């Protein structure tokens, strides 16, 4: 998840060569290029903007998976969006696997696993 793919062939090549070396491009190489990626998307703007103020996160991941299979494993919430007084504190905190019952605020960043690319 972190180093970006632990395929045996890769670790074998690293072990034998003791380093990494350049190589030509083949359809086999292009078959090693379609890994799933990880990113962060904004809930304020995007195709899911209408779902921005839809409290149930269950709804969020249900329609995400139905539309394009975007694995949403966590949310990134403003630390002052839980209150009512508008403040300039930009600091955000992470919530891991929110429940479906969990409420939602449009000012959110979603943790996304983009599909095979």
């Amino acid at each position: 998840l972190v180093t970006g793919g632990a395929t045996p062939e890769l670790e074998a090549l690293i072990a034998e060569e003791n380093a990494l070396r350049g190589g030509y491009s083949t359809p086999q190489t292009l078959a090693n290029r379609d890994r799933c990626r990880v990113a962060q998307l904004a809930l304020l703007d995007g195709p899911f903007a209408d779902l921005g103020d839809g409290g149930c996160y269950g709804d969020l991941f249900c329609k995400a998976l139905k539309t394009y299979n975007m694995l949403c494993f966590g949310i990134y919430r403003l630390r002052d969006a839980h209150l009512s007084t508008p403040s300039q504190c930009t600091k955000r905190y992470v919530i891991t696997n929110p429940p479906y019952e969990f409420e939602l605020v449009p000012t959110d960043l979603i943790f996304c696993l983009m599909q095979f690319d």
Partner: protein, 160 residues
């Protein structure tokens, strides 16, 4: 095929599955690759570093010297240079720090694309302005003297 990797408060919800069944790339092409560069080719003076526009990039501030342990900067940039990222999606990497430490580390980094080196301490704000620190996606503060320093007070001064 592989086991279903399950996230839950406890393994009971996890066991519910059984309980309730009812030359652009490298040799292997796994990461991006480039022809072996030269350090003097990638060293930027402050003037041209300011000239080179940077937006949505990564700035890695490194504290070190000629006598310091070697953090594996390579495996830091390896996930960044993953092949599933397109060439335009490749976030620019700018290592700002001492020239000696980066020189001792350049041997494992000449085979990577879109990587720049800025000699000069991170504590100087002029260097940070030159690399457009306000336009970077992430600034990573790293210290190579985490082990030579032993006193608690002397620890983490540079990072803070």
């Amino acid at each position: 095929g592989t086991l279903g990797f399950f996230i839950a408060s406890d393994a009971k919800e996890v066991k519910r599955a059984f309980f309730y069944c009812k030359k652009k790339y490298d040799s292997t092409g796994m990461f991006h690759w480039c022809a072996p560069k030269e350090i003097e080719k990638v060293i930027l003076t402050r003037s041209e570093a300011a000239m080179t526009v940077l937006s949505g990039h990564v700035v890695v501030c490194i504290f070190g010297d000629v006598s310091s342990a070697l953090i594996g900067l390579r495996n830091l940039v390896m996930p960044l240079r993953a092949s599933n990222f397109h060439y335009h999606e490749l976030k620019h990497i700018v290592f700002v720090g001492s020239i000696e430490y980066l020189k001792r580390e350049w041997e494992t980094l000449h085979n990577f694309p879109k990587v720049s080196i800025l000699p000069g301490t991170p504590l100087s704000r002029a260097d940070l302005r030159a690399v457009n620190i306000n336009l970077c996606d992430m600034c990573v503060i790293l210290s190579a003297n985490q082990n030579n320093i032993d006193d608690t007070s002397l620890q983490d001064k540079e990072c803070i």
